[PDB]
PDB file of all heavy atoms in Angstrom:
ATOM      1  N   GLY J   1       9.830  15.796 117.898  1.00  0.00           N
ATOM      2  CA  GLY J   1       9.135  16.527 116.808  1.00  0.00           C
ATOM      3  C   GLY J   1       9.256  15.878 115.428  1.00  0.00           C
ATOM      4  O   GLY J   1       9.472  14.666 115.308  1.00  0.00           O
ATOM      5  N   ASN J   2       9.141  16.699 114.385  1.00  0.00           N
ATOM      6  CA  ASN J   2       9.090  16.213 113.013  1.00  0.00           C
ATOM      7  C   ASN J   2      10.460  16.110 112.362  1.00  0.00           C
ATOM      8  O   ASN J   2      10.541  15.804 111.175  1.00  0.00           O
ATOM      9  CB  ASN J   2       8.199  17.123 112.141  1.00  0.00           C
ATOM     10  CG  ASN J   2       6.713  16.993 112.459  1.00  0.00           C
ATOM     11  OD1 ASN J   2       5.869  17.145 111.577  1.00  0.00           O
ATOM     12  ND2 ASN J   2       6.385  16.734 113.708  1.00  0.00           N
ATOM     13  N   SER J   3      11.528  16.447 113.080  1.00  0.00           N
ATOM     14  CA  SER J   3      12.867  16.309 112.528  1.00  0.00           C
ATOM     15  C   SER J   3      13.861  16.124 113.644  1.00  0.00           C
ATOM     16  O   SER J   3      13.619  16.529 114.770  1.00  0.00           O
ATOM     17  CB  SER J   3      13.257  17.519 111.661  1.00  0.00           C
ATOM     18  OG  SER J   3      13.411  18.680 112.449  1.00  0.00           O
ATOM     19  N   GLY J   4      14.955  15.441 113.332  1.00  0.00           N
ATOM     20  CA  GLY J   4      15.962  15.132 114.328  1.00  0.00           C
ATOM     21  C   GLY J   4      17.164  14.469 113.725  1.00  0.00           C
ATOM     22  O   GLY J   4      17.281  14.322 112.499  1.00  0.00           O
ATOM     23  N   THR J   5      18.105  14.123 114.590  1.00  0.00           N
ATOM     24  CA  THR J   5      19.409  13.660 114.167  1.00  0.00           C
ATOM     25  C   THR J   5      19.787  12.401 114.922  1.00  0.00           C
ATOM     26  O   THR J   5      19.708  12.384 116.140  1.00  0.00           O
ATOM     27  CB  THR J   5      20.472  14.726 114.449  1.00  0.00           C
ATOM     28  OG1 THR J   5      20.121  15.921 113.754  1.00  0.00           O
ATOM     29  CG2 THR J   5      21.872  14.267 114.008  1.00  0.00           C
ATOM     30  N   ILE J   6      20.219  11.390 114.197  1.00  0.00           N
ATOM     31  CA  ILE J   6      20.755  10.166 114.779  1.00  0.00           C
ATOM     32  C   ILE J   6      22.273  10.208 114.639  1.00  0.00           C
ATOM     33  O   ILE J   6      22.803  10.333 113.524  1.00  0.00           O
ATOM     34  CB  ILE J   6      20.158   8.954 114.084  1.00  0.00           C
ATOM     35  CG1 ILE J   6      18.639   8.967 114.286  1.00  0.00           C
ATOM     36  CG2 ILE J   6      20.789   7.688 114.631  1.00  0.00           C
ATOM     37  CD1 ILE J   6      17.868   8.222 113.253  1.00  0.00           C
ATOM     38  N   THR J   7      22.975  10.055 115.763  1.00  0.00           N
ATOM     39  CA  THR J   7      24.451  10.158 115.761  1.00  0.00           C
ATOM     40  C   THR J   7      25.128   8.868 116.126  1.00  0.00           C
ATOM     41  O   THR J   7      24.772   8.258 117.126  1.00  0.00           O
ATOM     42  CB  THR J   7      24.909  11.228 116.738  1.00  0.00           C
ATOM     43  OG1 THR J   7      24.276  12.463 116.351  1.00  0.00           O
ATOM     44  CG2 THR J   7      26.428  11.375 116.673  1.00  0.00           C
ATOM     45  N   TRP J   8      26.083   8.438 115.305  1.00  0.00           N
ATOM     46  CA  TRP J   8      26.970   7.340 115.625  1.00  0.00           C
ATOM     47  C   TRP J   8      28.353   7.901 115.945  1.00  0.00           C
ATOM     48  O   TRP J   8      29.028   8.432 115.070  1.00  0.00           O
ATOM     49  CB  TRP J   8      27.080   6.361 114.449  1.00  0.00           C
ATOM     50  CG  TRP J   8      27.956   5.166 114.710  1.00  0.00           C
ATOM     51  CD1 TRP J   8      28.116   4.506 115.892  1.00  0.00           C
ATOM     52  CD2 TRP J   8      28.730   4.429 113.734  1.00  0.00           C
ATOM     53  NE1 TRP J   8      29.000   3.454 115.734  1.00  0.00           N
ATOM     54  CE2 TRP J   8      29.354   3.365 114.412  1.00  0.00           C
ATOM     55  CE3 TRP J   8      28.965   4.568 112.356  1.00  0.00           C
ATOM     56  CZ2 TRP J   8      30.226   2.470 113.766  1.00  0.00           C
ATOM     57  CZ3 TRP J   8      29.828   3.675 111.723  1.00  0.00           C
ATOM     58  CH2 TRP J   8      30.442   2.649 112.419  1.00  0.00           C
ATOM     59  N   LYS J   9      28.792   7.732 117.187  1.00  0.00           N
ATOM     60  CA  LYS J   9      30.179   8.015 117.557  1.00  0.00           C
ATOM     61  C   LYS J   9      31.003   6.778 117.178  1.00  0.00           C
ATOM     62  O   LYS J   9      30.819   5.700 117.749  1.00  0.00           O
ATOM     63  CB  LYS J   9      30.280   8.329 119.047  1.00  0.00           C
ATOM     64  CG  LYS J   9      29.604   9.645 119.397  1.00  0.00           C
ATOM     65  CD  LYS J   9      29.947  10.076 120.820  1.00  0.00           C
ATOM     66  CE  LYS J   9      28.999  11.153 121.316  1.00  0.00           C
ATOM     67  NZ  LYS J   9      28.799  12.226 120.308  1.00  0.00           N
ATOM     68  N   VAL J  10      31.863   6.921 116.185  1.00  0.00           N
ATOM     69  CA  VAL J  10      32.565   5.759 115.621  1.00  0.00           C
ATOM     70  C   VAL J  10      33.714   5.371 116.548  1.00  0.00           C
ATOM     71  O   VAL J  10      34.566   6.187 116.851  1.00  0.00           O
ATOM     72  CB  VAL J  10      33.130   6.066 114.227  1.00  0.00           C
ATOM     73  CG1 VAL J  10      33.783   4.836 113.606  1.00  0.00           C
ATOM     74  CG2 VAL J  10      32.021   6.596 113.319  1.00  0.00           C
ATOM     75  N   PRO J  11      33.752   4.127 116.991  1.00  0.00           N
ATOM     76  CA  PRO J  11      34.874   3.701 117.823  1.00  0.00           C
ATOM     77  C   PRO J  11      36.203   3.747 117.069  1.00  0.00           C
ATOM     78  O   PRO J  11      36.247   3.529 115.863  1.00  0.00           O
ATOM     79  CB  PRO J  11      34.525   2.251 118.196  1.00  0.00           C
ATOM     80  CG  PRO J  11      33.141   2.033 117.772  1.00  0.00           C
ATOM     81  CD  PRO J  11      32.785   3.044 116.737  1.00  0.00           C
ATOM     82  N   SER J  12      37.286   4.016 117.796  1.00  0.00           N
ATOM     83  CA  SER J  12      38.604   4.210 117.182  1.00  0.00           C
ATOM     84  C   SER J  12      39.053   2.995 116.390  1.00  0.00           C
ATOM     85  O   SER J  12      39.642   3.143 115.333  1.00  0.00           O
ATOM     86  CB  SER J  12      39.670   4.563 118.237  1.00  0.00           C
ATOM     87  OG  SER J  12      39.276   5.714 118.943  1.00  0.00           O
ATOM     88  N   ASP J  13      38.765   1.800 116.884  1.00  0.00           N
ATOM     89  CA  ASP J  13      39.203   0.611 116.159  1.00  0.00           C
ATOM     90  C   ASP J  13      38.471   0.460 114.813  1.00  0.00           C
ATOM     91  O   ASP J  13      39.073   0.004 113.847  1.00  0.00           O
ATOM     92  CB  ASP J  13      39.115  -0.669 116.992  1.00  0.00           C
ATOM     93  CG  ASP J  13      37.723  -0.950 117.528  1.00  0.00           C
ATOM     94  OD1 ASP J  13      36.828  -0.098 117.428  1.00  0.00           O
ATOM     95  OD2 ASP J  13      37.531  -2.021 118.119  1.00  0.00           O
ATOM     96  N   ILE J  14      37.208   0.877 114.736  1.00  0.00           N
ATOM     97  CA  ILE J  14      36.522   0.863 113.443  1.00  0.00           C
ATOM     98  C   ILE J  14      36.978   2.013 112.565  1.00  0.00           C
ATOM     99  O   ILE J  14      37.295   1.801 111.392  1.00  0.00           O
ATOM    100  CB  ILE J  14      34.985   0.884 113.616  1.00  0.00           C
ATOM    101  CG1 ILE J  14      34.527  -0.453 114.241  1.00  0.00           C
ATOM    102  CG2 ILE J  14      34.285   1.122 112.295  1.00  0.00           C
ATOM    103  CD1 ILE J  14      33.060  -0.465 114.593  1.00  0.00           C
ATOM    104  N   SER J  15      37.030   3.219 113.125  1.00  0.00           N
ATOM    105  CA  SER J  15      37.471   4.392 112.363  1.00  0.00           C
ATOM    106  C   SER J  15      38.823   4.133 111.683  1.00  0.00           C
ATOM    107  O   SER J  15      39.012   4.509 110.549  1.00  0.00           O
ATOM    108  CB  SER J  15      37.436   5.689 113.211  1.00  0.00           C
ATOM    109  OG  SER J  15      38.233   5.604 114.348  1.00  0.00           O
ATOM    110  N   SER J  16      39.744   3.438 112.357  1.00  0.00           N
ATOM    111  CA  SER J  16      41.069   3.219 111.778  1.00  0.00           C
ATOM    112  C   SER J  16      41.090   2.286 110.584  1.00  0.00           C
ATOM    113  O   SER J  16      42.078   2.232 109.853  1.00  0.00           O
ATOM    114  CB  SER J  16      42.034   2.702 112.837  1.00  0.00           C
ATOM    115  OG  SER J  16      41.700   1.370 113.189  1.00  0.00           O
ATOM    116  N   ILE J  17      40.018   1.532 110.369  1.00  0.00           N
ATOM    117  CA  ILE J  17      39.992   0.583 109.239  1.00  0.00           C
ATOM    118  C   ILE J  17      38.858   0.832 108.243  1.00  0.00           C
ATOM    119  O   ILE J  17      38.650   0.021 107.350  1.00  0.00           O
ATOM    120  CB  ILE J  17      39.913  -0.877 109.734  1.00  0.00           C
ATOM    121  CG1 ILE J  17      38.698  -1.074 110.646  1.00  0.00           C
ATOM    122  CG2 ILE J  17      41.227  -1.276 110.405  1.00  0.00           C
ATOM    123  CD1 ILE J  17      38.355  -2.556 110.909  1.00  0.00           C
ATOM    124  N   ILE J  18      38.135   1.941 108.369  1.00  0.00           N
ATOM    125  CA  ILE J  18      37.041   2.181 107.397  1.00  0.00           C
ATOM    126  C   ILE J  18      37.610   2.236 105.985  1.00  0.00           C
ATOM    127  O   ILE J  18      38.686   2.840 105.733  1.00  0.00           O
ATOM    128  CB  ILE J  18      36.242   3.454 107.732  1.00  0.00           C
ATOM    129  CG1 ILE J  18      35.353   3.191 108.950  1.00  0.00           C
ATOM    130  CG2 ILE J  18      35.415   3.938 106.534  1.00  0.00           C
ATOM    131  CD1 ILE J  18      34.600   4.402 109.448  1.00  0.00           C
ATOM    132  N   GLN J  19      36.908   1.596 105.065  1.00  0.00           N
ATOM    133  CA  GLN J  19      37.277   1.587 103.662  1.00  0.00           C
ATOM    134  C   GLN J  19      36.392   2.526 102.881  1.00  0.00           C
ATOM    135  O   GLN J  19      35.228   2.226 102.590  1.00  0.00           O
ATOM    136  CB  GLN J  19      37.177   0.173 103.069  1.00  0.00           C
ATOM    137  CG  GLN J  19      37.416   0.093 101.566  1.00  0.00           C
ATOM    138  CD  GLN J  19      38.803   0.578 101.163  1.00  0.00           C
ATOM    139  OE1 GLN J  19      39.098   1.769 101.177  1.00  0.00           O
ATOM    140  NE2 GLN J  19      39.679  -0.361 100.804  1.00  0.00           N
ATOM    141  N   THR J  20      36.935   3.693 102.517  1.00  0.00           N
ATOM    142  CA  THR J  20      36.162   4.640 101.720  1.00  0.00           C
ATOM    143  C   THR J  20      36.285   4.410 100.227  1.00  0.00           C
ATOM    144  O   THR J  20      35.560   5.030  99.436  1.00  0.00           O
ATOM    145  CB  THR J  20      36.557   6.097 102.047  1.00  0.00           C
ATOM    146  OG1 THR J  20      37.932   6.324 101.714  1.00  0.00           O
ATOM    147  CG2 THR J  20      36.336   6.362 103.541  1.00  0.00           C
ATOM    148  N   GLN J  21      37.250   3.596  99.828  1.00  0.00           N
ATOM    149  CA  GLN J  21      37.569   3.403  98.421  1.00  0.00           C
ATOM    150  C   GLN J  21      36.902   2.159  97.871  1.00  0.00           C
ATOM    151  O   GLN J  21      36.390   1.335  98.625  1.00  0.00           O
ATOM    152  CB  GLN J  21      39.082   3.267  98.235  1.00  0.00           C
ATOM    153  CG  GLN J  21      39.924   4.362  98.860  1.00  0.00           C
ATOM    154  CD  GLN J  21      41.365   4.315  98.390  1.00  0.00           C
ATOM    155  OE1 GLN J  21      41.664   4.422  97.193  1.00  0.00           O
ATOM    156  NE2 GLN J  21      42.265   4.137  99.325  1.00  0.00           N
ATOM    157  N   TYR J  22      36.927   2.051  96.547  1.00  0.00           N
ATOM    158  CA  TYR J  22      36.566   0.809  95.834  1.00  0.00           C
ATOM    159  C   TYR J  22      35.162   0.343  96.186  1.00  0.00           C
ATOM    160  O   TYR J  22      34.886  -0.875  96.278  1.00  0.00           O
ATOM    161  CB  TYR J  22      37.636  -0.290  96.092  1.00  0.00           C
ATOM    162  CG  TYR J  22      39.021   0.224  95.787  1.00  0.00           C
ATOM    163  CD1 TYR J  22      40.016   0.274  96.751  1.00  0.00           C
ATOM    164  CD2 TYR J  22      39.295   0.792  94.534  1.00  0.00           C
ATOM    165  CE1 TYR J  22      41.266   0.804  96.441  1.00  0.00           C
ATOM    166  CE2 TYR J  22      40.526   1.322  94.218  1.00  0.00           C
ATOM    167  CZ  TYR J  22      41.514   1.335  95.172  1.00  0.00           C
ATOM    168  OH  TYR J  22      42.741   1.891  94.834  1.00  0.00           O
ATOM    169  N   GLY J  23      34.263   1.310  96.325  1.00  0.00           N
ATOM    170  CA  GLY J  23      32.857   0.997  96.525  1.00  0.00           C
ATOM    171  C   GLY J  23      32.446   0.888  97.975  1.00  0.00           C
ATOM    172  O   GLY J  23      31.309   0.517  98.251  1.00  0.00           O
ATOM    173  N   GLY J  24      33.347   1.203  98.907  1.00  0.00           N
ATOM    174  CA  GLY J  24      33.013   1.191 100.314  1.00  0.00           C
ATOM    175  C   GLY J  24      31.803   2.067 100.619  1.00  0.00           C
ATOM    176  O   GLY J  24      31.592   3.110  99.978  1.00  0.00           O
ATOM    177  N   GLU J  25      31.000   1.625 101.587  1.00  0.00           N
ATOM    178  CA  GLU J  25      29.756   2.274 101.980  1.00  0.00           C
ATOM    179  C   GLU J  25      29.635   2.435 103.480  1.00  0.00           C
ATOM    180  O   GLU J  25      30.183   1.629 104.251  1.00  0.00           O
ATOM    181  CB  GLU J  25      28.556   1.414 101.543  1.00  0.00           C
ATOM    182  CG  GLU J  25      28.338   1.344 100.067  1.00  0.00           C
ATOM    183  CD  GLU J  25      27.082   0.538  99.696  1.00  0.00           C
ATOM    184  OE1 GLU J  25      26.418   0.003 100.600  1.00  0.00           O
ATOM    185  OE2 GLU J  25      26.808   0.435  98.489  1.00  0.00           O
TER     186      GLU J  25
END
């Protein structure tokens, strides 16, 4: 239809190193 959701299940090895600070995106 006209709306929906795209989901990324984040792998544990990436989740453990995501950088939310200092301009992280």
Side-chain angles (χ1 to χ4, degrees):
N2 289 212
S3 68
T5 301
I6 299 156
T7 303
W8 182 34
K9 292 191 196 314
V10 184
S12 303
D13 57 351
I14 292 174
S15 59
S16 71
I17 56 166
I18 286 175
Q19 174 60 287
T20 63
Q21 308 192 59
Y22 308 120
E25 291 183 358

